[PDB]
């Protein structure tokens, strides 16, 4: 409005809000659709759900490849949003029991899920990079606020999705049976609206063209660099001062520098999948911990499941608080948070949150009697301090990661680094699946283990981040 902020980001944040609303509304009812409409096995339903989630996490690589290597962005966003809408149409069409049965439903649902995953993986990184591209490189301070607002929009969409989804599938009869078509069609309409609002701002955007087949050039440059050193029976100057310097007979310096920055950022990001896996193991164990503690709260009775909604709400509170107060207060003094100290502090906060969870579990275990009621039975409170610490860690880490990925990426591959950021989440989610089956430790001894692991990862990332060479 006033200055320093383009009007375009309005139809970026709004589009992201609508897209997250639709995605979460659909994913909430996906499992019930599998179990009570398709009548699938529990194993089959869970496996298909996890496969869909993994494909959603892994498709942004393909999306970013398309965007940066060809077609630019705002054209991959538009086309992948069209694919997303087609997938939603197929999915909602497979929930209609009138046409076909048990074969058309399955095929249509699976095809729609595949298309939805393709769309999400390619609307995720491209949208963030495109929104960040609206600011001049000099306006590096408004970009951080834009990214904070972007994360706020994502979390708000998730929260309204949680608050609105149960109404759609509450005692509604599509055709004599439970109405899943509405549950899958409302997200489709939301995605259509998101695409419409994003396209409405076409004439205001700052569409930059791609810099050529950047992915192919990067792959070829790395291949030549690696293959040049193979001087088994010779060698005087294979490569010195770097492993890319003597990949210089081709691939001019402006490309070697870009691939250098990409490799540096990837090496920095190497350990983030472990952090994601460790931090993800809190939405399931903390529910079990809540199940063992009183939840009357005097005024309103709180169920253990309902406590999960406290994360997005605390994120919504913290993002403005961190952006407008805490960071400003820190900047008041000479203390300098370099966007890499923020991530380390977030890791430390997550470790502290898990240590507090272990302490609360230890307090829970120490219960002795005086329907008998244990005197040392904690209320659902005492879970706030760990929800506060873990939420602050997510705000400091996730919001800073989006800005760091964009700020440290070459202009030719801005959205590739955003796929690298999401790639860590995809790998971390894979680690969770592999580790989920292995569970034979006490809750208190498991939390203390996660706290120690989160500390080891923080030290590894902190040391590597200390030697990181910023892009310039």
């Amino acid at each position, epitope marked *: 409005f006033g200055s320093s902020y383009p009007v375009s980001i309005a139809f970026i944040v709004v589009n992201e809000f609508c897209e997250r609303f639709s995605y979460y509304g659909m994913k909430a009812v996906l499992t019930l659709y599998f179990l009570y409409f*398709l*009548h*699938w*096995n*529990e194993d*089959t339903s869970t496996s298909v759900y996890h496969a869909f989630s993994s494909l959603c996490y892994f498709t942004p690589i393909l999306g970013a490849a398309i965007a940066d290597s060809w077609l630019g962005k705002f054209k991959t966003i538009i086309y992948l949003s069209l694919v997303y809408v087609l997938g939603h149409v197929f999915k909602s069409l497979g929930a209609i029991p009138i046409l076909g049965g048990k074969m058309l439903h399955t095929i249509l649902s699976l095809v729609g899920l595949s298309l939805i995953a393709l769309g999400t993986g390619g609307i995720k990184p491209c949208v963030a990079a495109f929104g960040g591209d609206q600011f001049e490189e000099e306006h590096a301070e408004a970009r951080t606020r834009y990214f904070s607002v972007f994360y706020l929009a994502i979390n708000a969409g998730s929260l309204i999705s949680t608050f609105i989804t149960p109404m759609l599938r509450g005692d509604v009869k599509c055709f004599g049976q439970d109405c899943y078509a509405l549950a899958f069609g409302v997200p489709g309409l939301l995605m259509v609206l998101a695409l419409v609002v994003f396209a409405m701002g076409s004439k205001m955007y700052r569409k930059p063209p791609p810099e050529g087949n950047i992915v192919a050039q990067v792959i070829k440059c790395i291949w030549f660099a690696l293959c040049n050193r193979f001087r088994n029976r010779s060698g005087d100057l294979p490569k010195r001062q770097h492993w890319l310097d003597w990949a210089a007979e081709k691939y001019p310096k402006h490309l070697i520098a870009d691939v250098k920055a990409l490799t540096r950022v990837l090496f920095l990001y190497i350990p983030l999948p472990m952090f994601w896996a460790l931090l993800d193991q809190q939405g399931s164990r903390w529910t079990l911990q809540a199940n063992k503690m009183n939840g009357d709260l005097g005024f309103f009775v709180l169920q253990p499941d309902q406590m999960q909604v406290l994360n997005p709400f605390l994120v919504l509170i913290f993002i403005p608080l961190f952006d407008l107060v805490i960071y400003r207060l820190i900047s008041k003094c000479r203390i300098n948070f370099s966007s890499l100290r923020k991530m380390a502090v977030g890791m430390i906060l997550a470790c502290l949150a898990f240590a507090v969870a272990a302490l609360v579990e230890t307090k829970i275990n120490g219960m002795i009697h005086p329907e008998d009621i244990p005197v040392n039975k904690l209320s659902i409170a005492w879970q706030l301090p760990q929800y506060v610490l873990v939420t602050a860690a997510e705000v400091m880490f996730s919001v800073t990661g989006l800005e760091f990925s964009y700020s440290q990426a070459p202009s030719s591959m801005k959205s590739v680094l955003q796929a690298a950021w999401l790639l860590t989440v995809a790998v971390g989610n894979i680690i969770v699946l592999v580790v989920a089956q292995f569970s034979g430790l006490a809750q208190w001894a498991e939390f203390v283990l996660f706290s120690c692991l989160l500390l080891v990862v923080c030290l590894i990332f902190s040391v590597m981040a200390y030697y990181y060479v910023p892009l310039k």
Partner: nanobody
Amino acid sequence: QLVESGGGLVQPGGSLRLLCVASGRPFNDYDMGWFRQAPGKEREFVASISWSGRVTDYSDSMKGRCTVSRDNAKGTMFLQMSNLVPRDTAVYYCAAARRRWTFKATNTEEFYETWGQGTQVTV
């Protein structure tokens, strides 16, 4: 494997509690379901309980209100029928399906592989 059943006559509006004990491999491995076969009719679906009992399903009719529960220790499964009527005076079967990946409906006869002998609950 080697599923069994137990039940008998019930009052016009009474209730019944049918058993199903597996005398083979571990009970936590198999998905279980209940079927009924009224005289001169086709085998119908009654209720289904998944391995670990997390997921439960009942037929649209579910005359009165059924409730299927299972414990994986001792391998026993219970069906609680509440508001039985003169109808549904059928022979109730127990079906077990070993866990695997399939696209066949869990509420169909084809999903299950081993059927025990059926009781003769009558009204």
